[PDB]
Specification:
This is part of a larger assembly, with chains A (208 residues), B (150 residues), C (235 residues) and D (138 residues).
Chain A lengths: L7 H6 L38 H16 L3 H13 L4 H10 L2 H7 L6 H9 L3 E3 L2 E2 L12 E4 L7 H9 L9 E4 L4 E4 L14 H9 L1
Antiparallel strand pairs in A: 1-2, 1-3, 3-5, 4-5
Helix pairs in contact in A: 2-8, 3-4, 4-8, 5-6
Chain C lengths: L11 E4 L11 E4 L3 E4 L1 H20 L4 E4 L6 H7 L7 E2 L11 H17 L10 H17 L12 E4 L6 H9 L4 E5 L10 E4 L5 H18 L15
Parallel strand pairs in C: 4-5, 4-6, 6-7, 7-8
Antiparallel strand pairs in C: 1-3, 2-3
Helix pairs in contact in C: 1-6, 3-4
Chain D lengths: L4 H14 L4 E5 L2 H13 L2 E8 L4 E7 L19 E3 L8 E2 L13 E6 L2 E3 L1 H7 L3 E7 L1
Antiparallel strand pairs in D: 1-3, 2-3, 4-8, 5-8, 6-7, 6-8
The chains are: A alpha+beta (208), B alpha+beta (150), C alpha/beta (235), D alpha+beta (138).
The structure holds two RNA strands.
GO cellular component, one term (chain A): small ribosomal subunit
Keywords (chain A): Metal-binding, Ribonucleoprotein, Ribosomal protein, RNA-binding, rRNA-binding, Zinc
Cofactor (chain A): Zn(2+); [4Fe-4S] cluster
RNA sequence: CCUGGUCCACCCGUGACGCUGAGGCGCGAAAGCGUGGGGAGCAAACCGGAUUAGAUACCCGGGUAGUCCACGCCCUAAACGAUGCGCGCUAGGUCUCUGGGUCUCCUGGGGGCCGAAGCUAACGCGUUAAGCGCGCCGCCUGGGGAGUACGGCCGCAAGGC
RNA sequence: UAGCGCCGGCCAACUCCGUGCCAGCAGCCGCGGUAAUACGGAGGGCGCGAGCGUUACCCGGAUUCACUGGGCGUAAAGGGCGUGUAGGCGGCCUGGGGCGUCCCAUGUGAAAGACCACGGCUCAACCGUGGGGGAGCGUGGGAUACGCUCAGGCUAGACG
């Protein structure tokens, strides 16, 4: 499914500016920079005080639509995190960040997460030399996420890695722009992520 | 400095020659999330006045909660009327698992991980009073050894 | 401060009935169906009570004297008309402490009417108001005679009969105000923070206790005052 | 007669402390005395002593209370907030060493009768033996 | 006249002989049944008089079974404190019945009222607990259908469990 | 290739028209008799997505058969009362036994499954390897506070 369709309507409905197109969510064209109200005929009307279930559902939907992961994989990852020892929320965020498509996005190979998903699915991304075409692939600490030697001549990768010159990467990632590769150093901490999501709200949403 | 959240708002009715006349009641919890909570039930002919009065009464009735790493020091069990509240400490990463009323009361108290259960009557007023008395009957190890000095 | 042997008539309590079991610790024995107070525990508690009174007085605190038993009214009305501790004499109005702001508004109206009768505005707005406000000021002075001195909540209260003045005691408990009281056998000592186990019906007991207490108050602030002119109220 | 003398003693202590009594007399027995040893050791009571009533031996338990509190209800806080018999006649409760409960997550005690005497939850756990779960006190 | 229970005082005797109690067994208001007797008053059914729109009622005049007795059945109830029994523990005040005692009063048993703590959804309970505990038995699991049907046991029947 | 359900409250999502206790909807409360956010259609929205709904069944919530964990004055519930059989329960002290109870050691607890770790199919599902377990029962040895039993003693219960 992948929800494929309009994206900045989620930028509007969630009330927080999301980055689903990469660019144009920074440019004054996101429609969140100019239309912050939710979509539909009844978007500009006075909003009623939402229920607690409303708040938790909206927060979980925000966190899910940020990564573009379906409800099935999302709930499975949450249950997997809850089975493990440690804080459920931080482990859940580390699991979501460990996805191959999200790592490709974080490493600057793609401008958006869905563009990264298409780059992975089409075999333009390799892991430790071997080609991997699975967005749900879990990257372990130490894996070298590289670009296919046959794909390093493509225009989009040239553009993205030409813009990545001088740009800093996450504290848990390393980037080699000349070799067009990177390394997943460690699992990111909660302080490492600046996501506008309260993970405890999602934990309480699935606690029901 | 003080967070304020309403539990429930209801409209009661008294009978008078001519018809029924309404009066609004509202529960309000106030907390600094540092270990202090307060519960208040305010009644007024209109809703905003009732909410303000409940906030005043809540700020007037405070309870110091002995938090121990975001959780409770020991499991408690309080019967208020027919409503029973059961509280139990939890390890971090668990979250607050409670009904709406106790979740709000404990969140405003500064609790982050706890396990609760409502038994008997599910009345929100009595459940709130039972949770308040539960937080009031909390003792620390320091308090325990203080009571057994002799 | 020299009331060791001069306690003549304080040991007499109430009858066998109309007592409180919690007072049994402060009772010596029963002579002719009348509870008699233990003479030793009387001064035993008097030490601590008068020590608290001295500590609170030398710090500049205010004590509210409450008396309505019709046997201590004329005594409290002058023992508190000494060093400026206020008093309540005719009857204790519900909410004088918990609803202190509204009673202070009543006091504002009292001094307002006192200012109107001090200004030449008495003649305007003719005799109808000149009688209405006259009676209003009369009853305001009747009820708020000593209470008008309280600018804020008192730091302690003094009671003559905590059973007769139970409402004032309860209001003091609600506001965490210390409760000093001359308790008898018909009262609950647990509610009293500083107990004085004496008699509440006799006039000499009340006169002795309150006179020595106000003397201790003025002694804590220096300038020992002459003996109180309450002896003539023996009648 | 008394069906459960131990529960009778526990209820005597409960009813005594609930009215803030000075001491309470319970019909004396070596078992009750060995329990009162644990009580006075853990600070729930000021102590106990053997006494004699008109013809028969009793045990005076001297109760313990907190400081007098402020505001309404100045009655002090109870030192024995809760004392409940567990292994009653007709349903006797025996637990292994790995089945000894932790009362109030440590703030309470559990009195056990084991083959090595009358112990507490932590005492029996340190000794490594279980037995009859007499009562829980906290 | 025969006879049961119970309370107190003395501290005399036995030495845990105790508590509860599925079944079983017996007692069990009134009404009702059988046999015999009795039958004043009352009185189902019934005979009438009124009232009423009608009055198979209330009101009025009569009146049988019955009410009564002996013997044998029947096993029901708002059989009610709508609160099973026993023991211990937990403020008092007042009224009363009944003992004992240094007989203003104390102490023991019983019957009421008000109330400490406490309990209760509340009303209320509160040393005669509905409080705090322990032991044992009985019973409850939404309302109607229904205390009906079936089966069994009991009963002369009505009918009961 | 994108579909399916929902948008009165529980429960996330609102307007227009049609209809007029009609036609219908409905898990529960309930909605419709002229201006329906509940019927029917449309627009819009919410939720999932190669699925979405429905029905049936099981556990859950349900502390609503209450061992953990409920009750019986007035809400369902104390037997009409007693006598008493079996059964359940048993005041204080000493000793013997060691049945209940407890402890140690040991055997048993197949594999698969479950849990944890690593690894193999590009991931996963799936699978492999290793690790950790565990009540119960058998055996040997030990403990005796409590419950039990036996023997004796005491008088506070009980009876005389
Ligand atoms: K290719
Ligand atoms: K309670
Ligand atoms: K005949
Ligand atoms: K009945
Ligand atoms: K007599
Ligand atoms: K039609
Ligand atoms: K519709
Ligand atoms: Mg977790
Ligand atoms: Mg977990
Ligand atoms: Mg505290
Ligand atoms: Mg209850
Ligand atoms: Mg319920
Ligand atoms: Mg319900
Ligand atoms: Mg075992
Ligand atoms: Mg430690
Ligand atoms: Mg003898
Ligand atoms: Mg003998
Ligand atoms: Mg019997
Ligand atoms: Mg029977
Ligand atoms: Mg009969
Ligand atoms: Mg008859
Ligand atoms: Mg006959
Ligand atoms: Mg005949
Ligand atoms: Mg006649
Ligand atoms: Mg007729
Ligand atoms: Mg008529
Ligand atoms: Mg006619
Ligand atoms: Mg007649
Ligand atoms: Mg005749
Ligand atoms: Mg006949
Ligand atoms: Mg009756
Ligand atoms: Mg009955
Ligand atoms: Mg009933
Ligand atoms: Mg009874
Ligand atoms: Mg009596
Ligand atoms: Mg009463
Ligand atoms: Mg009370
Ligand atoms: Mg009341
Ligand atoms: Mg009782
Ligand atoms: Mg039924
Ligand atoms: Mg039914
Ligand atoms: Mg029926
Ligand atoms: Mg019948
Ligand atoms: Mg039949
Ligand atoms: Mg037959
Ligand atoms: Mg018939
Ligand atoms: Mg018939
Ligand atoms: Mg029948
Ligand atoms: Mg809604
Ligand atoms: Mg529909
Ligand atoms: Mg269904
Ligand atoms: Mg129309
Ligand atoms: Mg319309
Ligand atoms: Mg509609
Ligand atoms: Mg649509
Ligand atoms: Mg399906
Ligand atoms: Mg179900
Ligand atoms: Mg269940
Ligand atoms: Mg449950
Ligand atoms: Mg059911
Ligand atoms: Mg149970
Ligand atoms: Mg129930
Ligand atoms: Mg009965
Ligand atoms: Mg037997
Ligand atoms: Mg027997
Ligand atoms: Mg024994
Ligand atoms: Mg036996
Ligand atoms: Mg032995
Ligand atoms: Mg053995
Ligand atoms: Mg296995
Ligand atoms: Mg399982
Ligand atoms: Mg692998
Ligand atoms: Mg093992
Ligand atoms: Mg063995
Ligand atoms: Mg031995
Ligand atoms: Mg013997
Ligand atoms: Mg005798
Ligand atoms: Zn955008």
């Amino acid at each position: 499914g992948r929800y494929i369709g309009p994206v900045c309507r989620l930028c509007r409905r969630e009330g927080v500016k999301l980055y689903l197109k990469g660019e144009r969510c920074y440019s004054p064209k996101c429609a969140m920079e100019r239309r912050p109200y939710p979509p539909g005929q009844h978007g500009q009307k006075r909003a009623r005080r939402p229920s607690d279930y409303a708040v938790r559902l909206r927060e979980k939907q925000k966190l899910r639509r940020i990564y573009g992961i379906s409800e099935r994989q999302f709930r499975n990852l949450f249950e997997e995190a809850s089975k493990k020892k440690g804080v459920t929320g931080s482990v859940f965020l580390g699991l979501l960040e460990s996805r191959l498509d999200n790592v490709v996005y974080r490493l600057g190979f793609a401008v958006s997460r869905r563009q990264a998903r298409q780059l992975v699915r089409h075999g333009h991304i390799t892991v430790n030399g071997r080609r991997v075409d699975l967005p749900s692939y879990r990257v372990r600490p130490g894996d070298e996420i590289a670009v296919a030697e046959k794909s390093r001549n493509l225009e989009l990768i040239r553009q993205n890695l030409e813009a990545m010159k001088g740009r800093k990467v996450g504290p848990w990632l390393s980037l080699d722009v000349e070799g067009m590769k990177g390394k997943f150093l460690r699992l990111p901490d909660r302080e490492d992520l600046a996501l506008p999501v309260n993970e405890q709200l999602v934990i309480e949403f699935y606690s029901r | 400095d003080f967070e304020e959240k309403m539990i429930l708002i209801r409209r009661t009715a008294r009978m008078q020659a001519g018809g029924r006349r309404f009066r609004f009641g509202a529960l309000v919890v106030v907390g600094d999330r540092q270990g202090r909570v307060g519960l208040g039930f305010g009644k007024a002919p209109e809703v905003p006045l009732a909410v303000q009065k409940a906030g005043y009464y809540a700020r007037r009735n405070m309870v110091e909660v002995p938090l121990q790493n975001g959780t409770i020091p020991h499991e408690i069990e309080v019967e208020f009327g027919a409503s029973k509240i059961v509280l139990k400490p939890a390890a971090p990463g668990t979250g607050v698992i409670a009904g709406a009323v106790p979740r709000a009361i404990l969140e405003l108290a500064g609790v982050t991980d706890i396990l609760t259960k409502e038994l008997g009557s599910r009345n929100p007023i009595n459940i709130a009073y039972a949770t308040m008395e539960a937080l009031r009957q909390l003792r620390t190890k320091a308090d325990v050894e203080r009571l057994r000095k002799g | 401060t020299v009331k060791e042997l001069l306690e003549a008539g304080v040991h007499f309590g109430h009858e066998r009935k109309r007592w409180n079991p919690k007072f049994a610790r402060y009772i010596y024995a029963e002579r002719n169906g009348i509870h008699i107070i233990d003479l030793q525990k009387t001064m035993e508690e008097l030490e601590r009570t008068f020590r608290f009174i001295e500590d609170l007085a030398m710090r500049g605190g205010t004590i509210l004297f409450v008396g309505t038993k019709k046997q201590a009214q004329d005594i409290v009305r002058m023992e508190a008309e000494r060093a400026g501790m206020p008093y309540v004499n005719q009857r204790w109005l519900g909410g004088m402490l918990t609803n202190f702001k509204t009673i202070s508004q009543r006091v504002h109206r009292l001094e307002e009417l006192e200012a109107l009768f001090a200004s030449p505005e008495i003649e305007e707005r003719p005799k109808k108001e000149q009688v209405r406000l006259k009676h209003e000021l009369e009853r305001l002075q009747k009820y708020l005679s000593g209470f008008r001195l309280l600018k804020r909540l008192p730091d302690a209260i003094f009671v003559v009969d905590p059973t007769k003045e139970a409402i004032a005691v309860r209001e003091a408990r609600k506001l965490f105000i210390p409760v000093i009281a001359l308790a008898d056998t018909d009262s609950d000592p647990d509610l009293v923070d500083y107990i004085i186990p004496g008699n509440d019906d006799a006039i000499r007991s009340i006169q002795l206790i309150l006179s020595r207490a106000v003397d201790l108050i003025i002694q804590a602030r220096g300038g020992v005052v002459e003996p109180s002119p309450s002896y003539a109220l023996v009648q | 007669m008394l069906t459960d003398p131990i529960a009778d003693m526990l209820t005597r202590i409960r009813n005594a402390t609930r009215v803030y009594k000075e001491s309470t007399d319970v019909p004396a027995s070596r078992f009750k005395e060995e329990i009162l040893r644990i009580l006075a050791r853990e600070g729930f009571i000021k102590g106990y002593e053997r006494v004699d009533v008109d013809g028969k031996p009793y045990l005076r338990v001297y109760l313990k209370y907190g400081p007098r509190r402020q505001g309404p209800d100045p009655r002090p806080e109870q030192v024995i907030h809760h004392i409940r018999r567990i292994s009653k006649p007709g349903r006797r409760v025996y637990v292994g060493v790995k089945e000894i409960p932790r009362v109030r997550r440590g703030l309470g005690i559990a009195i056990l009768s084991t083959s090595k005497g009358v112990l507490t939850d932590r005492e029996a756990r340190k000794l490594g033996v279980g037995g009859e779960l007499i009562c829980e006190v906290w």
